[PDB]
């Protein structure tokens, strides 16, 4: 019966408000082991589960190029402590918010998007967005606190995201990312190894540390691309913004 | 190349050529919606590729 859920989103996206709405008085504050940043946790029930809700610090992405936020969030997500995530998104700023969303969905951890500030926003076809992402999209009008039940329902029912190829990256980058992924320990699931490879090429200082036996293989990866791609990192970010644009266009 | 639109590279190249530009200029010259442009700039900024200038908004290349 226990389910651990991580709560993540961009800063100023209504993440704290949603955190309060779900837990109320059942909150405990501490710190992320080994650092000073506060770590807030809460408890609540669904009509199947006893949920432990871990608040992750507001973050624009999972890439660490001095903020610990991207690092903490990324480290926590990679640890496997959470069975699933609630990604809080500001409907009035999908162009900025979906970068984090895409990074999470590509990584493959089960997700439920809590679509916020739907009134502050443009009109969004919620179902199309759900289809484009491969995961549920639950609308919330927080000022009123509605949809919390739909969100709970989703937590009990959602098991795995639709297996979609969301982003189109240049062949060379995928080639090298897989080369890197082959050097990472087998305790890291296949899909996450490929993801870490791309994060390394993107310039993520942490994913590189987390990849151990490959950290020192990135220079040869960059040299192997010196022949084809000029700025690897810019290409990976660009590739992601290509689908963000496609998605935003198709649903807004 | 997905689509036929704004490439972060395109934004880079453009700025490399013009030295500095207002975000609105980029949105017109590149035929890409302003919110998309704004988000792309911030991303490149966070990566340390472009720099924002206070003078309103000038965007140019470097750390
Ligand atoms: Ni369960
Ligand atoms: Ni750890
Ligand atoms: Ni290229």
From Swiss-Prot, chain B:
This is Probable [Fe-S]-dependent transcriptional repressor. The keyword Iron applies. Gene3D superfamilies: Winged helix-like DNA-binding domain superfamily/Winged helix DNA-binding domain (1.10.10.10). Belongs to the FeoC family. Keywords: DNA-binding, Iron, Iron-sulfur, Metal-binding, Repressor, Transcription, Transcription regulation. One of its GO terms (molecular function) is iron ion binding. May function as a transcriptional regulator that controls feoABC expression.
């Amino acid at each position: 019966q226990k389910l651990t859920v991580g709560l993540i989103g961009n800063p100023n996206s209504g993440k704290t408000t949603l955190f309060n709405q779900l837990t109320g008085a059942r909150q405990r504050v501490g710190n992320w082991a080994g650092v000073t940043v506060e770590r807030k946790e809460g408890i609540f029930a669904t009509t199947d589960h006893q949920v432990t809700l871990v608040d992750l610090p507001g973050t624009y992405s999972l890439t660490t190029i001095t903020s610990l936020d991207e690092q903490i969030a990324c480290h926590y997500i990679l640890s496997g402590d959470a069975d699933m995530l609630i990604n809080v998104v500001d409907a009035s700023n999908l162009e900025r918010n979906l970068y984090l969303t895409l990074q999470l969905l590509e990584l493959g951890i089960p997700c439920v998007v809590a679509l916020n500030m739907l009134d502050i926003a443009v009109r969004i076809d919620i179902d199309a967005l759900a289809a484009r992402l491969g995961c549920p999209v639950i609308p919330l009008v927080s000022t009123r606190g509605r949809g919390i039940e739909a969100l709970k329902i989703a937590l009990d029912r959602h098991q795995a995201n639709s297996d979609l190829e969301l982003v189109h990256y240049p062949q060379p980058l995928l080639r090298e990312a897989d080369l890197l992924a082959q050097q990472m320990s087998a305790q890291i699931p296949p899909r996450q190894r490929r993801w870490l490879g791309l994060q390394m090429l993107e310039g993520d200082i942490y994913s590189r540390a987390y990849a151990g036996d490959a950290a020192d293989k990135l220079d040869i990866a960059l040299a192997n691309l010196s022949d084809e791609i000029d700025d690897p990192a810019l290409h990976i970010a660009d590739a992601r913004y290509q689908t963000i644009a496609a998605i935003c266009d198709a649903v807004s | 190349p997905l689509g036929s639109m704004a490439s972060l590279m395109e934004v880079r190249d453009m700025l490399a050529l013009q030295g500095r530009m207002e975000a609105k200029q980029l949105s017109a010259r590149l035929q890409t919606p302003q919110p998309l442009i704004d988000a792309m700039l911030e991303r490149m900024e966070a990566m340390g590729k472009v720099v924002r200038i206070s003078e309103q908004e000038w965007w140019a290349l470097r750390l």
